[PDB]
Design a binder for this molecule. Structure first.
Ligand SMILES: O=C(O)[C@@](O)(COP(=O)(O)O)[C@H](O)[C@H](O)COP(=O)(O)O
Ligand SMILES: O=C(O)[C@@](O)(COP(=O)(O)O)[C@H](O)[C@H](O)COP(=O)(O)O
Ligand SMILES: [Mg+2]
Ligand SMILES: [Mg+2]
Ligand SMILES: [Mg+2]
Lengths: 102, 467, 467, 102, 119, 102, 102
């Protein structure tokens, strides 16, 4: 199961994930978290973890939410998203956590 | 005398250097080389006249209509830097000269006869200002960049494609095999070569069948949405529709057409069909360099780019800059903006003669293709950014370990570069180091880099901007 | 190593100076300008490779097929008289590289990408040898010269036509009026301008209605069969068919299309429709000079002429030589033969690179149009002979007494010249005297001659043959 | 056989015709003369007498051409036309002379 | 769509709209328009004259044709169905169209002027 | 009634007609004679006078046949034709005689 | 589950397999190896083991690659293929190894 952007790289460390979150915020885009147990090519709508973090100011906030999502859903894939309302579309989506059965 | 019969100079009626264009006028910028002895404004007025309302002698039937309201006007003529025999002539055309939604009609006026006049030694259409009021008569892209990314569920990187090779001579089942290996190794797309239509060595229905078996197999195996641009370029509109319909029947998300060799009437029909059937439309620009290579005569690609965005495609080939086919960097950056952005200001340093508004018409994916390989990935990502399709035909099927390895090498190279960019690294300055980092853990990329180390395409550019 | 990955020179595989072409091969003659430092045979081999089977690096998938049987081969390279940087490269393409009956496919190979390579500064397709075995996959003209003359009941002289003017801006009823006056005065044909499609000032259905009232009225009044080329050039194939069908419904014998701006897919469909519906098809070559004007780059018209005869039209514009648009005499006489004759031997003095057999495919009427008037009639009859359409737009509607008088002047001038020729007179040496003889009893011709006395179009020719 | 505008009025005198021509010229429109022996509803295109008189300056010029047309075509219906190139259409068309067999 | 029914607004009239050229160009406009219609009818220099058939309802098809014939042959350019004449028990539409068009063509041939009935 | 080629010239004299016949024979084409009382644009098949003169060697032969056709059909239009079996079509067709009622 | 050519014969010995490879090479054809765990009638494209052995000179080379493929994929069906680029199609395809669960 490949998971689109960065799936052909080694799994990202927490430090590498945070750099991607910083890239999202640095460019004025909205970070978000999505998760699912059904990651295949048929699924356009992973579950939202809360709502896109329109009010997020720091990458650490987002990493804290990521850890909370993982603790609550350890058997799920979890992706970080970056969203731009001006183009109205996601500018980045990548899997940050894969479950043990991957 | 009922009226004044006989020959007048075109400039008496069609040169108006004090005309102010209206926001609804179509504007053209022509690089014009008059014959010696022909005043530049007479040559420009001949172009204006014979692309709008005039001919070579006075006709009484002008008086049946309001020629002042319908004539094109050359409203400005300027010398060209570095050439005392060329001029830029700016010509304004009233909006109601043009059939709504018809690039075919627009071309029949703007470029119909004026390139062949004896009085004009050479003529190049450099740019056009298409007003919003005319743009609104066109569909535009069937989907466009944002919708396409949503339909593919792909965000945050350029897409990756690949032309199957050898160009001609493969059987249908072999075509499916090489497609399967390419897609399953990490490419998003594969494609028919532009000249793969239907031939004795491989008939199109056989090809579509085996290719789509491969596409669906690779999609299920990898878990990522895949596509192969099935070529519907065909001798007749009836055949083109048959091929488009079978692609849809087999579940392809995408087709391609050679929009210039098929032509704008069939292209406009197909773009409408793709909108109506939810099919992504990849545009191949085969034949364009017949028209757009030389700086003294023809039509610059930036004009063709406007016309094809208006009719509509979801992808268009735009050149690589660094690959085997010519593409002037400055001009290319210019018409990439013309294809993707909603407003593009005039910019002489990129050959953009007019401000261009697109009135919310979606953008088209630029496609960089032709003689590129892994070492080009840093610069390709730098030139084009995320919203591009980067295609590696020889750069995939020429991997020493075969197609799946070649696909993995290109996908790894791309993702390493994108990761590095997002982290804040200077991917142009560090490009080689980034690739070598990824080659330490990707043997596929390592072998691709060894294969094409120091392969470059660096030649003097024919189609350059004025100095 | 499974195979030998990496970049080879194209000439290792695609230059074969000892290859003997087969009678079924498609042959191309390219005028090629290599970059400095690129061997001419490498540039020619790049063209051969990238228009047939090859790309820029070795691919293992070549070994799945029989590349020797499918590759194009540059089999001859020759210097160009008077230019030490240009060469003529002769390239042979196997018959089964091409989709049957598809000029679209042929173009996608022969002129698809090769004009844009960095290694080639300029490229012009000068001629092609189309083998009989490929010609037989095409319909050819819907009718052709002999059938058309039989359908019109016209024998022994060139036909006479006329483009309505002003180009744009006339209403439908005014279009019908000027058509009626032209046809009733002795012209066989009138026509829509190439850029008259459907527009705010005149919608196409209104035009077709009023024009066909005029055509039928002039035919009944004169007793001679008439036609107006109703333009079906349209944005989509669906619109094109609608316009063709309404022309038929109204009883028109003839339509026109801008075959290049509409494009070869729609053109091929329309040619088949014209065969199926007994409709004469006039081909306007709008946009051709974008492609075919310059001697260093593009496609010479003689190639386009072969392609359009294959797809099929009943008339094609071929230039005037003496009028306002450029047309090199020697080359024009050459491609007129290519359009009308069944066998044309190679002839360097007329730019004919290959012997061309047409295997009984009918000939196409050449159309001489653009800036010609009565004083040109002797030379036009001399250049083209009986099997031509001579068109006078400004030369009819610019008559000081109006259209019917202008039409009579052109018809009288033509018949006097034809009569004189048949009597054994030297119409080139006596042309002015013949016209003056007829002006003694035709006041209409007398006034036309006064109007355009000493109006000539004599300029240095850009597209000349090599010296 | 009615002939459209003014056909339901008594035949116009020469002075009444001239007043209609003066109306055409006063408004900047182009006077013309057409004629036919086939006046029915099938015929959109009566014969032009010369061309529309783009250069006419006075109503008398037009009346002189009308008399000439009548002299040359006494068996025909003859109409006066007024034409506007801005709207691009005729602004007035009426029969000025009917043949004896009317 | 909804703004005329809000509690907070007691009354609302849309008085005018400025339709920009860029939106207008997405529309066909009149099938023909004034100039083309005058050319199609060969009528220049006066208003055109029409007439609604009466009584509004209750006439038979053949009677509709009779009154149309008399109207058109007397000098009107047009006649018309009343707005509420569609198809009804007292007169079905195909019957009406048949008899009316007999009358239209007859009046056109008789008068020599082009006629029409707005079916 | 115009009659296609040469119809816009003054009627040809016998001498001018014979020159056209000589042009036909000189080029190896077959002269013929056709006639009709129904010359309009609907009629593709005028009556043959005999058959095309495949054996004709002199223009005088053809002019004699033309006079004989006229004497037999003085109320008809009569055309001279020139025919080429290689292209398989007529290379020339023009009216040599028009009846009194023309 | 039958697997096409030779599936109705008893499983081939290594020496019988090698004789089929020698037949491929003797005729100038290209030997190859494919394998899968999804052998049914829906699957046109078994996995390639490397590429077709364009450079193979001896049957033993191919038998060594077959043993390697088996060692690496003991749960898979493994077939030997022979390929002709002149006709452009496979000239022979047969299963050389079936997994234990067959
Ligand atoms: O036919 C070819 O050469 C390609 O398939 C590239 O092959 P490789 O990937 O093997 O080079 C593309 O069609 C060209 O890039 C088109 O040129 P452009 O994109 O300039 O229109
Ligand atoms: O638009 C024009 O100029 C014409 O209508 C000629 O007008 P005139 O008869 O008034 O000159 C023809 O389309 C040209 O001859 C086409 O050029 P070509 O025949 O070279 O393709
Ligand atoms: Mg290609
Ligand atoms: Mg024209
Ligand atoms: Mg009412």
């Amino acid at each position: 199961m490949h998971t689109e952007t960065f799936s052909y790289l080694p799994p990202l460390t927490d430090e590498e994930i945070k750099k991607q979150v910083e890239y999202i915020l640095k460019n004025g885009w909205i970070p978000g978290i999505e998760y699912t147990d059904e990651p295949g090519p048929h699924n356009s709508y992973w579950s939202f973890w809360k709502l896109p973090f329109f009010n997020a100011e720091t990458a650490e906030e987002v990493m804290e939410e990521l850890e909370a999502c993982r603790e609550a859903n350890p058997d799920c894939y979890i992706k970080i998203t970056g969203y731009d309302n001006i183009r109205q579309g996601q500018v980045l989506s990548f899997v940050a956590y894969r479950p043990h059965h991957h | 005398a009922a009226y004044e019969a006989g020959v007048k100079e075109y400039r008496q009626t069609y040169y108006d250097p004090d005309y102010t264009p209206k926001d609804t006028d179509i504007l053209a910028a022509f690089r014009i080389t008059p014959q010696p002895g022909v005043p530049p404004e007479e040559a420009a007025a001949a172009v204006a006249a014979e692309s709008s309302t005039g001919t070579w002698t006075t006709v009484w039937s002008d008086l049946l209509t309001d020629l002042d309201r319908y004539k094109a006007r050359c409203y400005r003529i300027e010398p060209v830097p570095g050439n005392d025999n060329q001029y830029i002539a700016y010509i304004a055309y009233p909006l109601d000269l043009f059939e709504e939604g018809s690039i075919v009609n627009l071309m029949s006026s703007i470029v119909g006869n004026v390139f062949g006049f004896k009085a004009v030694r050479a003529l190049r259409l450099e740019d056009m200002r298409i007003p919003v009021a005319y743009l609104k008569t066109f569909q535009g892209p069937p989907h466009g960049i944002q919708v396409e990314r949503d339909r593919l569920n792909k965000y945050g990187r350029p897409l990756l494609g690949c032309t199957i090779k050898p160009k001609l001579g493969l059987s249908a089942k072999n075509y499916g095999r090489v497609v399967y290996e390419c897609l399953r190794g990490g490419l998003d797309f594969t494609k028919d070569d532009e000249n793969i239509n239907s031939q004795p060595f491989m008939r199109w229905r056989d090809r579509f069948l085996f290719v789509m078996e491969a596409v669906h197999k690779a999609e299920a195996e990898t878990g990522e949405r895949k596509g192969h641009y099935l070529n519907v370029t065909a001798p007749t509109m009836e055949e083109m529709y048959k091929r488009a319909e079978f692609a849809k029947e087999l579940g392809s998300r995408i087709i391609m057409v050679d929009f210039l060799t098929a032509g704008f009437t069939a292209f406009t029909s197909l773009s409408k069909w793709c909108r109506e059937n939810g099919m992504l439309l990849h545009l191949h620009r085969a034949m364009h360099a017949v028209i757009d290579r030389q700086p003294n005569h023809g039509i610059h690609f930036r004009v063709l780019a406007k016309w094809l965005r208006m009719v509509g495609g979801d992808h268009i080939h735009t050149g690589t800059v660094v690959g085997k086919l010519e593409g002037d960097r400055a001009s290319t950056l210019g018409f990439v903006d013309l294809l993707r952005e909603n407003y593009i200001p005039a910019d002489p340093s990129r050959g953009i003669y007019f401000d261009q508004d697109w009135a919310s018409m979606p953008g088209v994916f630029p496609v960089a293709s032709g003689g590129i390989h892994v070492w080009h990935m840093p610069e390709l990502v730098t030139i084009f950014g995320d919203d591009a399709v980067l295609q590696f035909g020889g750069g995939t099927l020429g991997h020493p370990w075969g197609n799946a390895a070649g696909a993995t090498a290109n996908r790894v190279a791309l993702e390493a570069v994108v990761q590095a960019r997002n982290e804040g690294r200077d991917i142009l300055a560090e490009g080689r180091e980034i690739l070598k980092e990824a080659a330490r853990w990707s043997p596929e990329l390592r072998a691709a880099m060894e294969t094409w180390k120091d392969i470059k395409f660096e030649f003097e550019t024919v189609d350059t901007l004025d100095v």
